[PDB]
Design a protein around this ligand. Structure first.
Ligand SMILES: O=[N+]([O-])c1cccc(-c2cc(Cc3ccncc3)cc3cccnc23)c1
Ligand SMILES: [Mg+2]
Ligand SMILES: [Zn+2]
Length: 335
């Protein structure tokens, strides 16, 4: 074998070429997971941080960043089919694309950008692949600690920040206390808003925002106060989290297979424990296609429609894709 010396390996080259689509909706995220040796979150976060010059801006040592990223990625569960490091990388990358929408040019500070991306990276870390309700009903220690209230989402935040304390992991070591307090508050506000129980209120407020919407010649959005800025950042990451149906069908179905696998597993555990089987978790009584059409009509389309308005016309193709995917699942309901 010939030692490599200063030139990319061929796999690393194939990976680098795939990462050329980091700014595009529909990145081959599963290919990247494989090509990186199951390091999609590390490699995608690193690319995005370099692209946005965040290492220089926040004086983040490169070895510290990579060590933290690997450590964070190591705390997503390989055995969990959907809420794993690939989902995390996908939400990071989707948020990264949404941040660069023309309607949002020059709106956000570098610290706000850092908050949205870091929030996306950590938002599901240490997910056990079961719901808050399952954790509550079993009297889990986690549910006890967090008083049955946004149990997992509190946990995701606690773990994401806690991991900064591991050896050479404090990527925020050079931020001032003011910078850290601000970042921290934003990240917390964003991740706690990913609790699906908060969706309706979150959407309600986004609608209210679109109504009173203000722009400036060129048509870029105007956002004066923390309340408006964080609202947009919350809904942005929430859209990224619910972005699977807006991706090309080939990607969307892979996400659907994975979440169903994860749900059915929870249902098998509920059944064997003699518990009521949670909605959509019963593999003996599933209607996958009906359920996706319902997911889209009642949750995903309403959200994205409202986002497309806020940033009109930036999100038109994303919305078109969503509607094509809705039609595909509709036509697949076996009747
Ligand atoms: O009938 N449905 O609405 C329905 C049925 C089956 C799957 C879903 C669904 C929920 C969530 C987000 C989520 C994750 C965990 N708990 C709640 C929501 C993400 C998904 C991603 C891809 C496909 N289905 C998804 C929705
Ligand atoms: Mg979550
Ligand atoms: Zn998520």
């Amino acid at each position: 074998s010939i030692p490599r010396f200063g030139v990319k390996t061929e796999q690393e080259d194939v990976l680098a070429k795939e990462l050329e689509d980091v700014n595009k909706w529909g990145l081959h995220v599963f290919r990247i997971a494989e090509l990186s040796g199951n390091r999609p979150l590390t490699v995608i976060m690193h690319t995005i941080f370099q692209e946005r010059d965040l290492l220089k801006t926040f004086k983040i040592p490169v070895d510290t960043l990579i060590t933290y990223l690997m450590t964070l990625e190591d705390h997503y569960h390989a055995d969990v089919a959907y809420h794993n490091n690939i989902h995390a990388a996908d939400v990071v990358q989707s948020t990264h694309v949404l941040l660069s929408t023309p309607a949002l040019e020059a709106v956000f500070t570098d610290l706000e950008i850092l908050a949205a991306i870091f929030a996306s990276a950590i938002h599901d870390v240490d997910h056990p692949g079961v719901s808050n309700q399952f954790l509550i009903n079993t009297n889990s220690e986690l549910a006890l600690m967090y008083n049955d209230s946004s149990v997992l989402e509190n946990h995701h935040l606690a773990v994401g920040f806690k991991l900064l304390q591991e050896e050479n992991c404090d990527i925020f070591q050079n931020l001032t206390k003011k910078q850290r307090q601000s970042l921290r508050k934003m990240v917390i506000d964003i991740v706690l808003a990913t609790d699906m129980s908060k969706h309706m209120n979150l959407l309600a407020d986004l609608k209210t925002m679109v109504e009173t919407k203000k722009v400036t010649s060129s048509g870029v959005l105007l956002l004066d106060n923390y309340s408006d800025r964080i609202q947009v950042l919350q809904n942005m990451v929430h859209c990224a989290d619910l972005s699977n149906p807006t991706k090309p069908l080939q990607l969307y179905r892979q996400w659907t297979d994975r979440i169903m696998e994860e749900f059915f597993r929870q249902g098998d555990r509920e059944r064997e424990r003699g518990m009521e089987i949670s909605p959509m978790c019963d593999k003996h009584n599933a209607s996958v296609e009906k359920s996706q059409v319902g997911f889209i009509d009642y949750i995903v389309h309403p959200l994205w429609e409202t986002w497309a308005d806020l940033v009109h016309p930036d999100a038109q193709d994303i919305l078109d894709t969503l509607e094509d995917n809705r039609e595909w699942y509709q036509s697949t309901i076996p009747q």
